[PDB]
Design an enzyme around this catalytic site. Structure first.
Site, PDB file in Angstrom:
ATOM      1  CB  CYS A 152      -0.949   0.028   1.201  1.00  0.00           C
ATOM      2  SG  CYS A 152      -2.022   1.513   1.133  1.00  0.00           S
ATOM      3  CD1 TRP A 166      -7.145   9.001  -2.473  1.00  0.00           C
ATOM      4  CD2 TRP A 166      -8.288   9.206  -0.562  1.00  0.00           C
ATOM      5  NE1 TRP A 166      -6.313   9.585  -1.547  1.00  0.00           N
ATOM      6  CE2 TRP A 166      -6.992   9.723  -0.365  1.00  0.00           C
ATOM      7  CE3 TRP A 166      -9.188   9.214   0.506  1.00  0.00           C
ATOM      8  CZ2 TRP A 166      -6.564  10.228   0.856  1.00  0.00           C
ATOM      9  CZ3 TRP A 166      -8.766   9.732   1.724  1.00  0.00           C
ATOM     10  CH2 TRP A 166      -7.472  10.232   1.890  1.00  0.00           C
ATOM     11  NE  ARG A 198       2.238   0.701   3.575  1.00  0.00           N
ATOM     12  CZ  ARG A 198       3.409   0.095   3.760  1.00  0.00           C
ATOM     13  NH1 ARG A 198       3.761  -0.340   4.967  1.00  0.00           N
ATOM     14  NH2 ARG A 198       4.237  -0.092   2.739  1.00  0.00           N
ATOM     15  CD  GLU A 211      -5.263   2.112  -7.156  1.00  0.00           C
ATOM     16  OE1 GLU A 211      -5.784   1.003  -6.867  1.00  0.00           O
ATOM     17  OE2 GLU A 211      -5.420   3.150  -6.476  1.00  0.00           O
TER      18      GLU A 211
HETATM   19  C1  HEM Z   1      -6.432   6.496   1.498  1.00  0.00           C
HETATM   20  C2  HEM Z   1      -6.142   6.297   0.205  1.00  0.00           C
HETATM   21  C3  HEM Z   1      -5.406   5.035  -0.301  1.00  0.00           C
HETATM   22  C4  HEM Z   1      -4.666   5.002  -1.416  1.00  0.00           C
HETATM   23  C5  HEM Z   1      -4.410   6.205  -2.352  1.00  0.00           C
HETATM   24  C6  HEM Z   1      -4.144   3.661  -1.581  1.00  0.00           C
HETATM   25  C7  HEM Z   1      -3.333   3.195  -2.589  1.00  0.00           C
HETATM   26  C8  HEM Z   1      -3.073   1.863  -2.834  1.00  0.00           C
HETATM   27  C9  HEM Z   1      -2.666   1.327  -4.107  1.00  0.00           C
HETATM   28  C10 HEM Z   1      -2.435   2.198  -5.365  1.00  0.00           C
HETATM   29  C11 HEM Z   1      -2.505  -0.001  -3.970  1.00  0.00           C
HETATM   30  C12 HEM Z   1      -2.091  -0.970  -5.099  1.00  0.00           C
HETATM   31  C13 HEM Z   1      -3.390  -1.589  -5.614  1.00  0.00           C
HETATM   32  C14 HEM Z   1      -3.174  -2.415  -6.863  1.00  0.00           C
HETATM   33  O1  HEM Z   1      -2.218  -2.127  -7.624  1.00  0.00           O
HETATM   34  O2  HEM Z   1      -3.967  -3.364  -7.101  1.00  0.00           O
HETATM   35  C15 HEM Z   1      -2.827  -0.367  -2.593  1.00  0.00           C
HETATM   36  C16 HEM Z   1      -2.816  -1.627  -2.028  1.00  0.00           C
HETATM   37  C17 HEM Z   1      -3.323  -1.958  -0.780  1.00  0.00           C
HETATM   38  N1  HEM Z   1      -3.974  -1.103   0.089  1.00  0.00           N
HETATM   39 FE1  HEM Z   1      -3.982   0.970  -0.043  1.00  0.00          FE
HETATM   40  N2  HEM Z   1      -4.611   2.898  -0.535  1.00  0.00           N
HETATM   41  C18 HEM Z   1      -5.395   3.698   0.287  1.00  0.00           C
HETATM   42  C19 HEM Z   1      -6.068   3.311   1.426  1.00  0.00           C
HETATM   43  C20 HEM Z   1      -6.083   2.052   1.978  1.00  0.00           C
HETATM   44  C21 HEM Z   1      -6.908   1.640   3.080  1.00  0.00           C
HETATM   45  C22 HEM Z   1      -7.934   2.567   3.774  1.00  0.00           C
HETATM   46  C23 HEM Z   1      -6.630   0.359   3.321  1.00  0.00           C
HETATM   47  C24 HEM Z   1      -7.201  -0.568   4.408  1.00  0.00           C
HETATM   48  C25 HEM Z   1      -7.767  -0.138   5.553  1.00  0.00           C
HETATM   49  C26 HEM Z   1      -5.594  -0.063   2.379  1.00  0.00           C
HETATM   50  C27 HEM Z   1      -5.018  -1.306   2.308  1.00  0.00           C
HETATM   51  C28 HEM Z   1      -4.335  -1.818   1.220  1.00  0.00           C
HETATM   52  C29 HEM Z   1      -3.892  -3.182   1.039  1.00  0.00           C
HETATM   53  C30 HEM Z   1      -4.076  -4.350   2.038  1.00  0.00           C
HETATM   54  C31 HEM Z   1      -3.297  -3.267  -0.142  1.00  0.00           C
HETATM   55  C32 HEM Z   1      -2.665  -4.546  -0.744  1.00  0.00           C
HETATM   56  C33 HEM Z   1      -3.605  -5.126  -1.802  1.00  0.00           C
HETATM   57  C34 HEM Z   1      -3.075  -6.400  -2.440  1.00  0.00           C
HETATM   58  O3  HEM Z   1      -2.031  -6.931  -1.987  1.00  0.00           O
HETATM   59  O4  HEM Z   1      -3.703  -6.896  -3.408  1.00  0.00           O
HETATM   60  N3  HEM Z   1      -5.279   1.003   1.581  1.00  0.00           N
HETATM   61  N4  HEM Z   1      -3.182   0.799  -1.933  1.00  0.00           N
HETATM   62  N1  LIG Z   2      -6.757   2.702  -3.989  1.00  0.00           N
HETATM   63  C1  LIG Z   2      -7.042   1.488  -3.714  1.00  0.00           C
HETATM   64  N2  LIG Z   2      -6.596   0.533  -4.511  1.00  0.00           N
HETATM   65  C2  LIG Z   2      -6.538  -0.794  -4.214  1.00  0.00           C
HETATM   66  C3  LIG Z   2      -6.019  -1.273  -2.994  1.00  0.00           C
HETATM   67  C4  LIG Z   2      -5.958  -2.647  -2.743  1.00  0.00           C
HETATM   68  C5  LIG Z   2      -6.386  -3.536  -3.726  1.00  0.00           C
HETATM   69  C6  LIG Z   2      -6.906  -3.059  -4.933  1.00  0.00           C
HETATM   70  C7  LIG Z   2      -7.376  -4.019  -5.997  1.00  0.00           C
HETATM   71  N3  LIG Z   2      -6.194  -4.768  -6.465  1.00  0.00           N
HETATM   72  C8  LIG Z   2      -6.540  -5.550  -7.659  1.00  0.00           C
HETATM   73  C9  LIG Z   2      -5.465  -6.608  -7.892  1.00  0.00           C
HETATM   74  C10 LIG Z   2      -5.834  -7.352  -9.150  1.00  0.00           C
HETATM   75  C11 LIG Z   2      -5.582  -6.759 -10.387  1.00  0.00           C
HETATM   76  C12 LIG Z   2      -5.916  -7.424 -11.558  1.00  0.00           C
HETATM   77  C13 LIG Z   2      -6.506  -8.681 -11.496  1.00  0.00           C
HETATM   78  C14 LIG Z   2      -6.853  -9.386 -12.762  1.00  0.00           C
HETATM   79  C15 LIG Z   2      -7.282 -10.709 -12.742  1.00  0.00           C
HETATM   80  C16 LIG Z   2      -7.602 -11.360 -13.930  1.00  0.00           C
HETATM   81  C17 LIG Z   2      -7.493 -10.690 -15.146  1.00  0.00           C
HETATM   82  C18 LIG Z   2      -7.067  -9.367 -15.165  1.00  0.00           C
HETATM   83  C19 LIG Z   2      -6.745  -8.717 -13.975  1.00  0.00           C
HETATM   84  C20 LIG Z   2      -6.759  -9.273 -10.253  1.00  0.00           C
HETATM   85  C21 LIG Z   2      -6.417  -8.608  -9.076  1.00  0.00           C
HETATM   86  C22 LIG Z   2      -6.696  -9.235  -7.721  1.00  0.00           C
HETATM   87  N4  LIG Z   2      -5.929 -10.480  -7.550  1.00  0.00           N
HETATM   88  C23 LIG Z   2      -6.968  -1.696  -5.185  1.00  0.00           C
HETATM   89  C24 LIG Z   2      -7.895   1.127  -2.549  1.00  0.00           C
HETATM   90  C25 LIG Z   2      -8.703   0.029  -2.203  1.00  0.00           C
HETATM   91  N5  LIG Z   2      -9.260   0.210  -0.978  1.00  0.00           N
HETATM   92  C26 LIG Z   2      -8.941   1.344  -0.290  1.00  0.00           C
HETATM   93  S1  LIG Z   2      -7.874   2.261  -1.266  1.00  0.00           S
HETATM   94 CL   LIG Z   3      -9.129  -1.107  -9.103  1.00  0.00          CL
END
Ligand code: HEM
Ligand SMILES: N=C(Nc1cccc(CNCCc2ccc(-c3ccccc3)cc2CN)c1)c1cncs1
Ligand SMILES: [Cl-]
Ligand code: HEM
Ligand SMILES: N=C(Nc1cccc(CNCCc2ccc(-c3ccccc3)cc2CN)c1)c1cncs1
Ligand SMILES: C[C@H](O)[C@H](O)[C@H]1CNc2nc(N)[nH]c(=O)c2N1
Ligand SMILES: C[C@H](O)[C@H](O)[C@H]1CNc2nc(N)[nH]c(=O)c2N1
Ligand SMILES: [Ca+2]
Ligand SMILES: [Ca+2]
Ligand SMILES: [Cl-]
Ligand SMILES: [Gd]
Ligand SMILES: [Zn+2]
Lengths: 401, 401
Positions: free
Chosen positions: B105, B277, B108, B282
């Site tokens: 993330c 947000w 953070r 993304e």
């Molecule tokens: C406040 C604004 C926030 C922004 C701008 C942000 C940004 C991001 C981004 C860009 C990712 C990568 C997502 C991806 O590429 O699929 C990520 C991952 C993650 N975020 Fe944040 N985030 C935010 C808030 C939060 C909050 C509120 C939580 C939980 C309470 C959180 C927990 C996580 C976790 C667990 C991941 C790992 C997801 C994974 O491994 O698939 N984030 N975040």
């Molecule tokens: N800003 C944010 N972002 C964010 C944070 C954590 C996780 C995610 C979603 N991560 C998606 C990872 C992913 C990407 C592509 C595909 C996929 C699968 C099959 C075909 C094509 C693509 C699958 C996954 C999940 N394994 C977004 C926030 C979400 N909450 C608060 S902030």
């Molecule tokens: Cl997304």
């Protein structure tokens, strides 16, 4: 026990069976990953035997009579002298393999095509300079670049080492001031002050090509100027931003790394400079746009009349792209070999396919293979990778000072 | 302890926090797997004890009578029942810690600002839906986005889990076209077919918001339609490319991940959706330009009259930058919170600095922190990182089907 490796664009799965043969340990543990860090007698014999076995396996002469003869030869030579000598063919194969094994090299599709210059008969810094000039001449080839390595005498006990003090054969000077900053390349501020102390009277430009500090064993290093006609450069211009030429930017044709150690069968070559050609992001993104390098991003954005007071206009991204456009355009105009990051990452994917069939995997450092702009626009972003150390290898080594 | 260098600045830290890593990662000294996407009452007690110690440390009351009494209270409940219950204050702290510990993330810097909705008394899928709608309402806040998590009942023996089957609360349908292709978002093809399977009448657009499949303990999932006025969306236009608006592109305001398991003090919460947000890359880079997602890069480039036949024009890079521009411009126009990758990575650098002082390190996954465009233009590219698993944590978990 064989890591599963997934490509997320296509969904294809392979298994890296090569990682089992990793001879050395890397920096990671089950507790913590350090993959993003830049710098992570009977002993000689075991490495020497391992390499000979590799070589004869690779020519299908495995376990034959020539295989055992060479094995006994190295045994006797090490007992007689403490070390041993590579046959010229073993040196060639070992240099190709050290390139083939380099986890951070996206250009390894070319690994089988490498000109090896045997300089193991070299002595004195004067001869060193002649070998290097021949290498530069051959590798530059009027802009049609050709990959080459020159191998200087290996390390051995009691004797000093051959070292090229410069990190690359072609480096632009970097000069500090009472205003503190650097004019030229900040990367080379150290080698610039060394060249000055050892004779060189400094220039005052942003792209003053440095001299060479070449070191023969035990002798202090000797200062050598490079014939300007030997150092091909490319003045940078842009296909449609006609003011870009007036920034006076330039870069050199030949990337030739001179500070890495080549290791083959337990032998160590502290001076073995290699060259290929550039990937354009190395120049247009890292060298020119890094905050701690030339750092020209904002200059270009001001000239493009971009809004630099808000990050969300993406003025940095736009200026970077045009700088990379300028590099590709300027090298092609000058008929100097260069490869853009899309073509190069596409070829590395092919190389991954070829290596999977050739030996069950390929060590790759994701953080270094993915280009520094447009990462996920290239196929290597979506490719899982396994990083591990194989020998023969190129390794970092301490500075001679 | 691992030495950690920033190559832009030259500064050096040691990550002492990594020494407290509980769970093991995928890497070994023989091989690094850091680039891979998916790598008894006595263990419960040590995890609970550690978490209680963390909570009392956070409020500067370590070793207090309240601290000792709460450890004894947890000890007694685990002995009597095999599990225990968090105090509300511990739940809030644990959810914030799990965000703070998430290595992938980049947002953070915000980790202390999290609205924690306590839904541990939830008893049906219908009540789940009410709790979720209130979350979306609160977090969306008509575009002024507010981070929030809703924590549904913990896993306990002898009862099925609560689960949200959807990977996010708001997702666009992915209709498996018969040509083996997809209409809509390909990431959501599995959950789309499960929705139809469970009685949802599908649309045929490219941005059809999916219904929710909510699972109460020991119950097949139930289908719930999100009220359209609850789902804020942003039409995509470009500030200067007027034809862009005719692409018909849209994205939703609220990223709300719903398929991760929240783990606090050894307790497991398999349904705990969280939202914040978007960072614009993304949407603009991954969701719209990944070849295996909406894959719009070539079409935008053609509208931009770029030369899409040679890679070296960098038409991919140019189209990608304008698409990211359109996303940022459109969210700002709609007054929906969004952060660009420059600002987000700069704030992440402040977070690393905060965390070095507060805890002596920060777990961080370089491959995920560096944005998918303009990587080395952002400061995190030049920052070495150490990846490790702390608890409380957000964890991947198997799909409920
Ligand atoms: C406040 C604004 C926030 C922004 C701008 C942000 C940004 C991001 C981004 C860009 C990712 C990568 C997502 C991806 O590429 O699929 C990520 C991952 C993650 N975020 Fe944040 N985030 C935010 C808030 C939060 C909050 C509120 C939580 C939980 C309470 C959180 C927990 C996580 C976790 C667990 C991941 C790992 C997801 C994974 O491994 O698939 N984030 N975040
Ligand atoms: N800003 C944010 N972002 C964010 C944070 C954590 C996780 C995610 C979603 N991560 C998606 C990872 C992913 C990407 C592509 C595909 C996929 C699968 C099959 C075909 C094509 C693509 C699958 C996954 C999940 N394994 C977004 C926030 C979400 N909450 C608060 S902030
Ligand atoms: Cl997304
Ligand atoms: C022929 C075309 C080649 C291309 C396009 C290419 C491209 C690259 C690039 C972009 C890097 C990353 C460098 C950096 O970011 O600082 C790299 C690293 C590297 N290359 Fe290649 N290269 C080529 C040829 C060669 C040759 C001929 C050798 C040796 C025989 C070689 C060995 C290496 C090694 C050892 C590294 C790792 C350097 C390090 O770890 O710091 N490459 N290459
Ligand atoms: N295409 C090529 N490229 C290439 C390949 C291997 C190595 C290199 C040079 N690698 C530079 C590593 C580096 C970069 C920046 C800094 C630095 C230091 C201080 C301040 C700022 C930056 C330090 C280092 C070395 N640690 C280029 C070829 C070179 N030969 C044949 S092909
Ligand atoms: C800290 C980080 O490892 C460092 O910036 C790396 C990242 N990836 C890289 N990739 C390449 N090709 N070259 C580099 O110098 C680096 N630097
Ligand atoms: C193979 C590689 O790990 C994969 O494509 C990763 C790389 N970095 C990422 N970084 C983020 N933020 N999100 C991702 O989905 C990914 N995917
Ligand atoms: Ca002064
Ligand atoms: Ca109780
Ligand atoms: Cl370079
Ligand atoms: Gd226009
Ligand atoms: Zn690792």
């Amino acid at each position: 026990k064989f890591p599963r490796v997934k490509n997320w664009e296509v969904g294809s799965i392979t298994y890296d069976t090569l990682s089992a043969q990793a001879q050395q340990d890397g920096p990671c543990t089950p507790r913590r990953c350090l993959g993003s860090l830049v710098f992570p007698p009977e002993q000689l014999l075991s490495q020497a035997r391992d390499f000979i076995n590799q070589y004869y396996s690779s020519i299908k002469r495995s376990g034959s009579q020539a295989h055992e003869q060479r094995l006994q030869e190295v045994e006797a030579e090490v007992a007689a002298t403490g070390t041993y000598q590579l046959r010229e063919s073993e040196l060639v194969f070992g240099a190709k393999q050290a390139w083939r094994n380099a986890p951070r090299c996206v250009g390894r599709i070319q690994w089988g095509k490498l000109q090896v210059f045997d300089a193991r008969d070299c002595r004195s810094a004067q001869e060193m300079f002649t070998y290097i000039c021949n290498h530069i001449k051959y590798a530059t080839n009027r802009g049609n670049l050709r990959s080459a390595i020159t191998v200087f005498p290996q390390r051995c006990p009691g004797r000093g080492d051959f070292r090229i003090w410069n990190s690359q054969l072609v480096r632009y000077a970097g000069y500090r001031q009472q205003d503190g900053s650097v004019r030229g390349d900040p990367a080379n501020v150290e080698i610039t002050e060394l060249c000055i102390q050892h004779g060189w009277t400094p220039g005052n430009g942003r792209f003053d090509v440095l001299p060479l500090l070449l070191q023969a064993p035990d002798e202090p290093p000797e200062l050598f100027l490079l014939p300007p006609e030997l150092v091909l450069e490319v003045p940078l211009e842009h296909p449609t931003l006609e003011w870009f030429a007036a920034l006076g930017l330039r870069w050199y044709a030949l990337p030739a790394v001179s500070n890495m150690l080549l290791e083959i069968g337990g032998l160590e070559f502290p001076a073995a400079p290699f060259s290929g050609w550039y990937m354009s992001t190395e120049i247009g993104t890292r060298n020119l746009c890094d905050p701690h390098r030339y750092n020209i991003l904002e200059d270009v954005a001001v000239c493009m009349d971009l809004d630099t007071r808000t990050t969300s206009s993406l003025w940095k991204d736009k200026a970077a792209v045009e700088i990379n456009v300028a590099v590709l355009h300027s090298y092609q105009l000058a008929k100097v070999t260069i490869v853009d990051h899309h073509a190069a990452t596409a070829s590395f994917m092919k190389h991954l396919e070829n290596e999977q069939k050739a030996r069950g995997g390929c060590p790759a450092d994701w953080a270094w293979i993915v280009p520094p702009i447009s990462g996920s626009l290239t196929p290597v972003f979506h490719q899982e990778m396994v990083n591990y150390f194989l020998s023969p290898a190129f390794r970092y080594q301490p500075d001679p000072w």
